[PDB]
Amino acid sequence: SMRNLDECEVCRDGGELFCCDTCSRVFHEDCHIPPVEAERTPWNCIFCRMKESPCQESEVLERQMCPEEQLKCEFLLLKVYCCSESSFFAKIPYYYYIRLKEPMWLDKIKKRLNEHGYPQVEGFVQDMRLIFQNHRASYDFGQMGFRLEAEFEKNFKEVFAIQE
């Protein structure tokens, strides 16, 4: 249609693209988080939905991952993936096969979050943070990840309205 773009919002590539009912953004099935259900009546992307949504951090993390919490984490993970640095931290870290708290990567967090494998917000946020902690303790990589981390931590505060 004339009201939707022809590049996936996340990876800027063509192929099988699903249109958001409201905005111009389009997505590959698995590029959107959670995955696109074209079944739906209609399909709206998570940005347009979260736009229409209506305190200490300790509180937020302790929260059980109920339908709203689950959506907000999915919202945060989609923003992480939309950052150009997501490429680097998507798969197994480079360092992993070279002769450090737990190997972590975005595709691992993505599978877990889509599978409802985090009982609390804390599980998601801690895995996300571990990616950067593990990174820091290695090698010669400049500011790689600085933007991905900073962006997540800004969005995390904003989405759960953490203290100023």
Epitope: S1, D21, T22, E39, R40, T41, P42, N44, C48, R49, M50, K51, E52, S53, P54, C66, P67, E68, L71
Partner: single-chain antibody, 226 residues
Framework: EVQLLESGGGLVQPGGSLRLSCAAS????????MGWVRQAPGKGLEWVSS????????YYADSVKGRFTISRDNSKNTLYLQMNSLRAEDTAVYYC????????????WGQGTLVTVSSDIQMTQSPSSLSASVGDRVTITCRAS??????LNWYQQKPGKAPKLLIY???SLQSGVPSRFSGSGSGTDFTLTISSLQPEDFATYYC????????FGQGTKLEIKR
């Protein structure tokens, strides 16, 4: 501040046509999904049609397919329902309702306008009818034909009033609703629970799936004991 006012309801000969309009104010009209829900006198709620972003995103009940046409003019903040080939089945109060796309629930309802004539997801609601006392713990339940994830809403309706949203996203308490109300469940089986029943809680309660179109439960009348 938010107001939905329906008009265009009235008397029609069978087979004839009628056009319902709903004037919206107090919210960004194009940012919101808009639905029509009817209710026959004494009967439960039935989703008719909802429109989202333009004519490409229109949905109808099998009942009214190829017979009713929903439309919107965002420039005039108006929702329309064209009604053709009208039966007696169609005689009902037609509510204008705003569907928030956050988790696909109807948080704002008009007064309703009355029209007088001369393989979807089913929602079973146990019990049909309940007698309880002030202070008692009440648990109404909804079951779904197939899985509807957490896209499940709970509504209260009282005599002479429009439905009111209690719960959205299966277990989220709508702003203003007292804390004694709570929802639970996901997949097929769901539960509305009132911890300590209050005089004002005597009403009819409908559940509603949002997963694919909308389908309402049969309703559950909660009445006082002797």
């Amino acid at each position: 501040e938010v107001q939905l006012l329906e008009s265009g309801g009235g008397l029609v000969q069978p087979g004839g046509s009628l056009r319902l309009s709903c004037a919206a104010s107090g919210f960004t009209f194009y940012g919101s999904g808009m639905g029509w829900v009817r209710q026959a006198p004494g009967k439960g709620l039935e989703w008719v049609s909802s429109i989202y972003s333009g004519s490409g995103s229109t949905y109808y009940a099998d009942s009214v397919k190829g017979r009713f046409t929903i439309s919107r003019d965002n420039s005039k903040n108006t929702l329309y329902l064209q009604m053709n080939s009208l039966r007696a089945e169609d005689t009902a109060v037609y509510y204008c309702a705003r569907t928030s796309i956050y988790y696909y629930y109807m948080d704002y309802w008009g007064q309703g306008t009355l029209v007088t004539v001369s393989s979807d997801i089913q929602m079973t609601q146990s019990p049909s009818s309940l007698s309880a006392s002030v202070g008692d713990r009440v648990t109404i339940t909804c079951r779904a034909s197939q899985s509807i994830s957490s896209y499940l809403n709970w509504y209260q309706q009282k005599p002479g009033k429009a439905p009111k949203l209690l719960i959205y996203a299966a277990s989220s308490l709508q702003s203003g609703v007292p804390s004694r109300f709570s929802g639970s469940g996901s997949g097929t089986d769901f539960t509305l629970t009132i911890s300590s029943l209050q005089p004002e809680d005597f009403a009819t309660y409908y559940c509603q799936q949002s997963s694919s179109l909308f389908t309402f439960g049969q309703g559950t009348k909660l009445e006082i004991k002797r």
